Amino acid sequence: LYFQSMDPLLSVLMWGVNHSINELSHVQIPVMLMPDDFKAYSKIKVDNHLFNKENMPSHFKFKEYCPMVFRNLRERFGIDDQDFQNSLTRSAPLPNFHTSYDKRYIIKTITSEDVAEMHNILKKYHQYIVECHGITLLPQFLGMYRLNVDGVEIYVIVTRNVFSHRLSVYRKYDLKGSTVAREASDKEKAKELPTLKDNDFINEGQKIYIDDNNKKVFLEKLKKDVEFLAQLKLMDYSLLVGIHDVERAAPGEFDPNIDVYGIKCHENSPRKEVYFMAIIDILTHYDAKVNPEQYSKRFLDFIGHIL
Amino acid sequence: NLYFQSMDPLLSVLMWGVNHSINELSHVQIPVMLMPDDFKAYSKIKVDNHLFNKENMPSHFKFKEYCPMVFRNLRERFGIDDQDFQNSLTRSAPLPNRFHTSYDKRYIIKTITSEDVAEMHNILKKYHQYIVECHGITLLPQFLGMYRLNVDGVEIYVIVTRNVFSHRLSVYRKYDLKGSTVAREASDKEKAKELPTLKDNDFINEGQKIYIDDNNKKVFLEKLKKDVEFLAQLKLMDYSLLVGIHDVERAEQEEVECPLAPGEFDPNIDVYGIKCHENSPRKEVYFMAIIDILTHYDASTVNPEQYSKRFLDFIGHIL
Numbered sequence: 001l002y003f004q005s006m007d008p009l010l011s012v013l014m015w016g017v018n019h020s021i022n023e024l025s026h027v028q029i030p031v032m033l034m035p036d037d038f039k040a041y042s043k044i045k046v047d048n049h050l051f052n053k054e055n056m057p058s059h060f061k062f063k064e065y066c067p068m069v070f071r072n073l074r075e076r077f078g079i080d081d082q083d084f085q086n087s088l089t090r091s092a093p094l095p096n097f098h099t100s101y102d103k104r105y106i107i108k109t110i111t112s113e114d115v116a117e118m119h120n121i122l123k124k125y126h127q128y129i130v131e132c133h134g135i136t137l138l139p140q141f142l143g144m145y146r147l148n149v150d151g152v153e154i155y156v157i158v159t160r161n162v163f164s165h166r167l168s169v170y171r172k173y174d175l176k177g178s179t180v181a182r183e184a185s186d187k188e189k190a191k192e193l194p195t196l197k198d199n200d201f202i203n204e205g206q207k208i209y210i211d212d213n214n215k216k217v218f219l220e221k222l223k224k225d226v227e228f229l230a231q232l233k234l235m236d237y238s239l240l241v242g243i244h245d246v247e248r249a250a251p252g253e254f255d256p257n258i259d260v261y262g263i264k265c266h267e268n269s270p271r272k273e274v275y276f277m278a279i280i281d282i283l284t285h286y287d288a289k290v291n292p293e294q295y296s297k298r299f300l301d302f303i304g305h306i307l
Numbered sequence: 308n309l310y311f312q313s314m315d316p317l318l319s320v321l322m323w324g325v326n327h328s329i330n331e332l333s334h335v336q337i338p339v340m341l342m343p344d345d346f347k348a349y350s351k352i353k354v355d356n357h358l359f360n361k362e363n364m365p366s367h368f369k370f371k372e373y374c375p376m377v378f379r380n381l382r383e384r385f386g387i388d389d390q391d392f393q394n395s396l397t398r399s400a401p402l403p404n405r406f407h408t409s410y411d412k413r414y415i416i417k418t419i420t421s422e423d424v425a426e427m428h429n430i431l432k433k434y435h436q437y438i439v440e441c442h443g444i445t446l447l448p449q450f451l452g453m454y455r456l457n458v459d460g461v462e463i464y465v466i467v468t469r470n471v472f473s474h475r476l477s478v479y480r481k482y483d484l485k486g487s488t489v490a491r492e493a494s495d496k497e498k499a500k501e502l503p504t505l506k507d508n509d510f511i512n513e514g515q516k517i518y519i520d521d522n523n524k525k526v527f528l529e530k531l532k533k534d535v536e537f538l539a540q541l542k543l544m545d546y547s548l549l550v551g552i553h554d555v556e557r558a559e560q561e562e563v564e565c566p567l568a569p570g571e572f573d574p575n576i577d578v579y580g581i582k583c584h585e586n587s588p589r590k591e592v593y594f595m596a597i598i599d600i601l602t603h604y605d606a607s608t609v610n611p612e613q614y615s616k617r618f619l620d621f622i623g624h625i626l
């Protein structure tokens with residue numbers, strides 16, 4: 001492992017994640033998080049002269065936001081820190097956002113405002129993860145960092161992939177229940193796997209066929225998740241839906257501990273499929289800005305309407 | 308697992324820095340050979356933590372490592388694995404004697420000046436070439452790492468060397484030997500201690516003998532000559548022979564109170580040890596090597612050539 005990349009910001013992220021996790025290994029796991037933990041960080045500035053000049057950039061910084069909370073979150077979400085460390089570090093992330101090399105994790109560039117909003121909600125989010133025992137369709141926020149190389153400064157967040165680390169998605173949708181129409185562009189639609197939207201789903205007559213028990217379970221989690229978001233005055237979020245086609249292809253199978261968002265289709269489905277659905281893109285507050293209770297009602301009715 | 312806690316924030320930072328340096332190196336290729344740039348290279352790390360790991364460590368500190376590639380190569384040439392090294396310096400805190408020893412008594416840690424660091428750079432290329440040419444077999448100080456630490460407004464430079472003494476076998480007498488210009492003996496205050504550093508006059512007046520056989524004496528003096536000729540060339544002086552003596556019977560009677568045989572030692576670990584000859588009055592083991600090498604002539608007083616001869620003549624006469 002040398003953390004080499006053509007993109008210096010990915011070297012620095014791999015370096016940083018490697019450092020972050022090793023550093024945490026020299027820190028006790030607390031009986032519980034305290035308020036100070038939610039306002040915490042570690043900054044590390046590196047200046048090398050004529051050393052490791054080929055693998056990495058000579059001058060850089062790495063900052064990790066509330067390392068103790070994100071570590072706790074990882075544990076709550078069933079994620080081992082060394083598995084995490086390996087996933088983001090054994091090979092470079094691939095641009096599609098980026099994905100870890102093993103497709104377990106999403107890496108996204110965000111703004112300082114996003115970072116401030118993550119802080120704004122982090123205690124309530126954490127308590128909510130405690131209360132729901134980590135069972136939820138919220139984004140699993142696993143790490144949040146600031147990087148500076150070459151006079152360039154970005155903020156990044158890591159989340160769990162909604163989709164399978166292994167089974168491919170032939171179709172993907174971003175759904176909001178917008179009353180205003182939402183269609184993919186001709187530019188988006190020109191891709192191999194476009195990110196389609198509400199009107200695409202309707203115009204295609206897309207059907208998601210899940211059994212009654214799974215639908216109940218799913219729509220109950222969804223309701224509590226979205227009542228929480230409405231409680232925080234968050235909005236503009238979407239349900240991301242991926243469809244694995246088992247016929248193009250042991251064939252139907254997935255580990256529900258890794259691909260935690262996976263749901264098998266109804267046995268009587270006309271088409272043998274697996275669906276991957278969860279909420280993404282939650283960090284937009286009403287103050288920055290139809291209101292959050294309304295958004296959440298409208299969102300939840302549309303999801304109900306398609307199953 | 309390891310927290311790097313100490314009452315001494317400089318020891319905490321050192322433990323953290325050594326841990327970080329060795330880990331970083333695990334992510335840098337071992338080159339087929341050193342290049343000139345490696346002898347002027349450094350890594351600096353500045354760490355600022357806020358409301359994080361505030362019990363185990365200082366929140367704000369800096370750690371700088373000089374010529375990491377060279378010291379790693381030196382470690383390899385001296386027979387030392389970087390993971391072993393890391394463990395020795397980080398598993399438990401270094402113990403104060405002024406110098407510290409690593410907790411497992413393999414390594415010496417010393418605070419040095421800015422001038423000393425400058426002198427280490429001055430000689431590093433010739434030192435490394437000399438270590439290459441002698442396959443690591445020398446009585447010179449093995450220089451294994453050199454760091455600059457900053458915490459709480461205090462800045463120190465530190466160097467790590469291999470311990471002259473045994474990691475296991477205890478030393479009941481020790482001497483710093485130069486010879487020639489004197490009245491060089493330990494102070495009343497020093498001779499108070501449990502293990503004083505005795506000097507030239509103490510060696511003579513105490514009737515100290517060293518019972519090594521004809522072969523070991525000749526092999527040792529032929530190394531010393533080579534190393535001391537080398538130091539002369541570099542124009543260094545004011546260096547010592549550090550001698551420590553293990554007394555088997557004392558170490559035993561002082562244990563019984565509380566599988567290598569008594570008096571035996573691993574010569575791959577305790578590289579400076581010499582067994583006493585079969586006719587020694589008491590069974591002893593000697594640990595002898597050169598220390599304290601970094602004084603440049605250009606700095607009545609002697610010159611390096613004069614210093615070296617007096618030194619070799621002195622040691623040759625006591626054995």
Ligand SMILES: CCOc1ccccc1-c1ccc(-c2nc3c(c(N[C@H](C)C(=O)O)c2C#N)CC=NC3)cc1
Pocket residue numbers: 097106108110114157159160161162163172174195240280281282283
């Ligand atoms: C635009 C502002 O984004 C943020 C701001 C603050 C905090 C988080 C985020 C954020 C993080 C992750 C994702 C995200 N997560 C996942 C996927 C994503 N893929 C995108 C939508 C596609 O396929 O087009 C994305 C995307 N983009 C795909 C699969 N699992 C998860 C989205 C947003």
Ligand SMILES: CCOc1ccccc1-c1ccc(-c2nc3c(c(N[C@H](C)C(=O)O)c2C#N)CC=NC3)cc1
Pocket residue numbers: 405406415417418419423466468469470471472481483504549598599600601
């Ligand atoms: C005064 C400036 O000192 C230096 C400057 C630049 C580079 C190196 C050093 C330096 C490094 C190490 C040692 C050293 N090494 C060893 C011992 C030491 N113990 C001391 C002398 C005692 O027993 O009194 C010492 C001491 N002090 C004991 C056993 N093996 C080694 C001495 C000097």
